Every structure is written in structure tokens, then in C-alpha cells.
Amino acid sequence: HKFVQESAKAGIDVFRIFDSLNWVDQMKVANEAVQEAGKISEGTICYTGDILNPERSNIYTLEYYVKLAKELEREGFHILAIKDMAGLLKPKAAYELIGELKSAVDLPIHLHTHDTSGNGLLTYKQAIDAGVDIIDTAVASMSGLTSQPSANSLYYALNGFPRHLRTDIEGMESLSHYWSTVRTYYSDFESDIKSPNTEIYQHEMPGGQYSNLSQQAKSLGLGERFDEVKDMYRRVNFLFGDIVKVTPSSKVVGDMALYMV
Amino acid sequence: VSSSKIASFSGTKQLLDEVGPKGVAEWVKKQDDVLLTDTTFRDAHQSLLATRVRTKDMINIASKTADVFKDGFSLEMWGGATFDVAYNFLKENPWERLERLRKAIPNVLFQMLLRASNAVGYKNYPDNVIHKFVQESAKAGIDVFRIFDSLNWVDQMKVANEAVQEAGKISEGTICYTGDILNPERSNIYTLEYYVKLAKELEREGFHILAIKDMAGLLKPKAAYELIGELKSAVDLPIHLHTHDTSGNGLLTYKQAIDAGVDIIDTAVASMSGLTSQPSANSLYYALNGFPRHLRTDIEGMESLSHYWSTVRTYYSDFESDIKSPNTEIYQHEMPGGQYSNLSQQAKSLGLGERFDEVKDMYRRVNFLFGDIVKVTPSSKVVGDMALYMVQNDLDEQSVITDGYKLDFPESVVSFFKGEIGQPVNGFNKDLQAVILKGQEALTARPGEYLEPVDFEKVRELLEEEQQGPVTEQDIISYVLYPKVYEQYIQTRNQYGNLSLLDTPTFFFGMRNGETVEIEIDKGKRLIIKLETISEPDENGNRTIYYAMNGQARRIYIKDEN
Amino acid sequence: QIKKLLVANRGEIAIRIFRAAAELDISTVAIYSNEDKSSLHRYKADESYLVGSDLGPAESYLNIERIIDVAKQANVDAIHPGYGFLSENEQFARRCAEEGIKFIGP
């Protein structure tokens, strides 16, 4: 409550509230705080599994996300947020999921993915066909791979289609040119992830991790057999009942995975 | 994958044999899944690594590749810069690369990119050169020549096409995409109508497959839908689409084409994919889950190829471009592949580094000044050179005509207006052309018709005199296409042996004190070499390497350059 | 009428056979294990192959089935077993007949 109080006073208007395990019960305190500040609170569902594949999960099915949305809408969130933290929301599934959610709650919908599969723009392209309200994007030179899709590419990807992406591309290019140079100052901190990686569709590590669980693996003896660390990562996750993996639940599955190999 | 299992596979190579080209094409239109062509051995590294990837790296995965792409359409693995860059910087015979791959991968069509006018070379050649080179090519394993012309000038295509029908291989005829069919303001000339007309013509010249070479990733998503829509309905050729991912919109483009019913697309494995390379086949594969059509391939295999190439790429970090994020200004200037970067390694390299925002602009302006052309090789070099020249010389659109009489326009542009790259869609503006050639007549006919057929026989006697005794027909057209370079390939080989046999790290860095490398020379003949020490230089700068090589102490003397 | 010969053995006896072979004008082929990468005989033949990159120490000159596979792959005509590995092994000389490879012994 203090933190939300000072944060709201300091400048911050929209609190995207998420729970590592989609446990709605836990989102109640931050929520009340925000409302008291009279600021905007987005209730967030974190995505896992694959609504397209009926043998991926008995649990994280499309009825599961709807029921949740409706649950959050009952709690008085202003905006529903889809946090696709691992880049797992496939283009087709984006279409069904956003479609289903729209006609099952009146909250506007705010979608956030990662381009780590190389399919994030499609995933937006589709989310938009289905009627998403807001999407997170990044300036071209600060985007793609484990970041968000480039707003600049998205701007043009939508030429010819019904819905427009409301923004200033001339200015965007200027901004992107800026962050090109600026990003050069940070080069000692770049990841090695230099291309798309579809294996996320098996292991599900959220944004960073895979690249930081790979240092780790290598500090230990494991370096020459991330082949196992990843494989176990999947299995630990099933061993733990099939869990949502963000911070810190994802640290958990990570550590256990190292431990076990 | 064992060589014996591979023997057991029957893919599209087999199918060409069984039913011919005519028949392969029909079979394509039959299939429902999207067929794919891999560009990892060619376009993908041409874009991302200066075409430096070496034979040895490709032969090592040849056999895992033949398995993974068991059901793909072709492997693009020759043509483009590869011919020149292999002889020249890599100092290895492209022909051996083809030969060796061919045996390693016997089940999948081999594809190369043929330049309608001059194949693979660097100037203009008489036609019997084009023919010889295509004859020997098809003799060595190529099954699909994708013939494109750098100004979409159908006429210059007829000859390389004639050469392909003669070897009864597949002939892929290529439209190059420019402008923006979604946007009526962009061109009065490059409009859905132009492509359809231009596709029908190609069908009549009798090509088996119609290919769209979106060489600058200009082909937006909706536009691909529209464009492939109309094409699939104005012609009965299968359609084979090639984009680059340089806008960031490539998968989207492909996903769009697929819906319109494209037949084959060009893709690369994830780790050699992206940005100015092809879209990532891995990514597309999953992207399609849930929609009607699906990519025909082996992901679990592909994820494995991806991992290989991820590591091998490392061996080449010295040739990575600085392109590291997608770039949508490519829609204003239409610079193909590298150029956007390359042209920049040029504009600082004579002091307009601080005004590249002007150069990219002049590039756009010079294009229209040339009446709005198709910008691939070498036509893209011409535009690039004007752009430089004009900024450097405080030049504008009106003053290129005023001051023309006393301006040295670059050889690339005088040569363009001379008819020598070929004939631009729209023709030449007369008053610009005049100021540029200062009298010189222009060709009135494809630059080809003009030239004495080469005497292949004077060449043999020249090459047999110079070298050993055994000179092949590949030695001959290699000489013809690249005289100065081929001569040099041969100095090196004589001096240093067959370098293509080395592993890439040793090719590029040598050895470190203590290290033991092995080179596989022939079957069951290998060299085991250990570098023991290099001494300190002597009176006149000649260091003494202490090696062991096959249970034999050895001493080599090398000139240091302090 | 022997053109290609393969010595199923290592060390001095192998070098001895190559020397005879040489003088009879017969291409040789040597086999080695992981730990003979550097054994002299390895370098004395025209060709040389590793038996069982999978396999171990002195149970690598003892693998009938792999050696015969190396032999077939080099289009081998005879195998000379030297002494004290497969030289007396009844089973080995038989799988040699079967495969077309003349076993140089009784």
C-alpha cells in the first residue's frame, strides 16, 4: 500500500498487476491500493500451454482463461491484460484467445508478447483481427528476439488490412535511429540470443532466463549438456503440477532443473 | 546420417528423373502443404556473412541436411556471389563444392540463382559462354536454375532459358518485385497489372516455375496476398516466392502468400535466418499451427540444423554485418540486401558519414531520376554510385543536366545508360542519357548479341600450356568468367595445396603452440599436424616453425612482417 | 590377382606386411584404435582407418564385424591377420570367405 501510494503520487498512472501463478486471491491487495489512488489497474493473466493443442494441458485450456478473465473483471480491474511472458501465444491461438475474451468480458484488452519465437508480429497481426485494444511494442532498434515486436514493422505490416496502428512512423524512425547509437553504449550487456528459438514451445523459459540459466549451467559442470538442463526444465515443470513460469516461479523451475541434472 | 540410409531416400531429385521438369512442376501444383526451399548454403550466408561460408562447413552437415529436407523442394546452394567468392577470398573451387554436396545429398533438387545476362560472372559474355556454363553446371548436379534479370527485361532471359531446356533441367523464370502494389501513388508502372502481364509473358517463353524475387523485402503482407492471388489465377505455373526479412515482416508476408496459395517458399534455418536473410523456417513451421495449410518439413530435425549452424557461424564473426535490428526505411529507398549497410561502409569511407541521411535520400531521388528502375545487382550498384556522386558534388536533379557536359559520371552509370546492364522497363530519358555518354553510342539490343563467341579451344591450349596437363571443361568456363581470379586460384593451389580441406578455424587463424589438428585429405588418408614452437625471428626475419606431422619431425621457414 | 590388402593388426608385424605388399605392388590399408592414433604402423600403409571410434583398447583389433566392414568399404581383397589377435580366430577367417575377402592363412 505505501509503495502504490508513493508510486501514484510520483507519476505512475497504470499498474499492470500480475501474480506468478495466476492466483487471483493474491492480486486483491495491490488492486485495492491502486483504486484508492484512483489510478488505472490492469488485471493480468499470464499465458502458458497452448489452447490449440488439446494434449498440452488438461488445465490451461481456453475455458480456463475465460473463467479467469471473468473472475478478474468481477474484482473490478479496469483493463484486462494478457501477459505472454515466454512468447508462447501462437498466432492462431492469439486469434481464438483474444476473440473469446472480448465476448466474455467488457474490459478493454491489452496484449503483451515477446518476439522470441520470431512470430510476435503475426501474433499481434492476429490479436488485432480478433479486436485487441492495446498492444506492447518497441521501437525498431530496441526490439525483436526476446524483446517485443517492433512497432515500426507492425505499422507497415497492417497496410491493406482493416485496423490501423495509431502512431507516428516518421517519429518512430527517428527514435529508433536514436536507440541504435545509444544501445551501442551497452554492448557489454547484450545477450547472445541472436536469432529466433522455437524450442521455447517445449521448455517455456520466460524472456531472460534461457540466456541466464546458461551461464549458470556452465559455472557448474553442466555447460557441455544444457541438452539435459532444458529437457529437465520441462519435466520439472510437469513434476511440479504444470505451473505458470514467470518471476519467480520460473527461478524455481530453473534451480530445480540444475539441481537434478 | 549413414550414407546407406540416404541412398534409400527418394525425394525430388528422383522425381525429376522419373517424370522430367514439365512433370515436376505439375507435381508441385498437386501438393497441398507448402513446399520449401532451403537457402542456408547460399542466400542466407550471402546476406549475413559476406558469402564467406566455406565448403568444409557445408559438407559436414550435408548428410544431416539430406535427411531433414528429405521432403523439401530444393536446396539453393550455388550461384549468386558464391561462384566468385569461393575462387577469390576463400580460395576454393566452387565446382568441388557442388560435386561433393551432390554426392552427399542425392535426394533433393539442387537450385542455383542464374543471372539472365551473365550467369554468375561479372561482365557481359557471348552466348556460347552462357551455354557452356549452364551445360557444365547441369552436368554437375544443378537441377533448378532460377533465372532472373536485373531489370525484369524478359528478352535477356531467353538465352539462359534456352540453355536450360537443352539440358532438360527445371527453368525458374523470375520477376523482381519493386514499388508497392497497395499504393497507387508509388508507381504508374509497377502495378498489379504489370506483374500479371509480366507473368503471362514468362509462361509463354516456357519456364516451368514462376518465381518472385523480392530482393529487398519490399513485398508487404497484404501485397503478397493480392499479388499471389492474381498470379495463381492468370498463370498455371507453380509459384515460388523469395523474400528477405529486412523489414521484419517476412514471416507475415509468407503467411499471407500461403493463404493465397503460394506453392514453394524460400526459408533458412533459425540461426542463419532473420533481418537481411530469409525468414526462419523453424518459426514459420509453428506459426502455421491452426490454419489450413502447413509447411512440409522436419522441425525436430531443423531445430537440430539450427544448432549446428549457430556454432559454425561463430567461426565467421569477422564477416557479420552491423544490421542487428529490422529496418522499415527500406520502404522509402528500396536498397536491396546488404547495400543499406554496404553503401554506408562507403559514405563515411569518403566523409559523408554525417550526411548518410542525405545519401539515403539521394538514392531515392536517383532512382526516380533514372525513371524508376528495378534495383538488384548490378542495377543497385549504379543507383548507389549516383547517389554518392551527387551528394559529394552538391548535385541536384536539374543540375545534373546543366553541368553534365563537364562531369565525370561514374563508369557504373555511363555503362547503364549505354545499354550494358540491359534495357530499363521505362526506357532512358533522352536528355539525361545524352549528358552522361557524351557522344558514345548506346547498344540497341541486349549487350550479348554484340560479341564474338569465345573460342573455347584457344583457351584450353592456353590453360594446358600454363598449368599441368589435365584441364577440364570446368577449368575453362571458370577461366572465361573469371580470368584474373581463376589464374590466382591456381597460383594459390600450387603454392599451398587444396585449402578447402582445412577446417575453418585453421583456415583463418592457423595453429597455436601445443595444438594438434587433423586434416582429412582423401578417404583414410589424413594429416595429423602438431605445432611445437615458433622460434624468434633471425638476421633477416625468417622464423622457424617446429612441427610434428605423421610421426615425423618437420621444419618450416616463414617470412615475418614485424 | 590381389590388388587391395588390409592388415588386421598393428605394430611391427603390420609394418612387415605392408613392406611385402609394397614390393608385390599391392595397395595397403591399416587399421588402428583411439590409442594408436600415433602408432607408426598407422602411417606406413597407403590408407588407414579407425576401428570402432565406438570401441576400446585391445578389444578393437578383436572386433570381427567392424573390421570386415572397414575392409568392404575400402574394397579390400585379402586380410592378413598377422599374429596374436584374429590370426587363429576360426570365426574371423569364415566371415572373410562369406564377404569375398581372402583370409591370408590356412
Ligand SMILES: [Mn+2]
Ligand atoms: Mn514482459
Ligand SMILES: [Mn+2]
Ligand atoms: Mn535474394
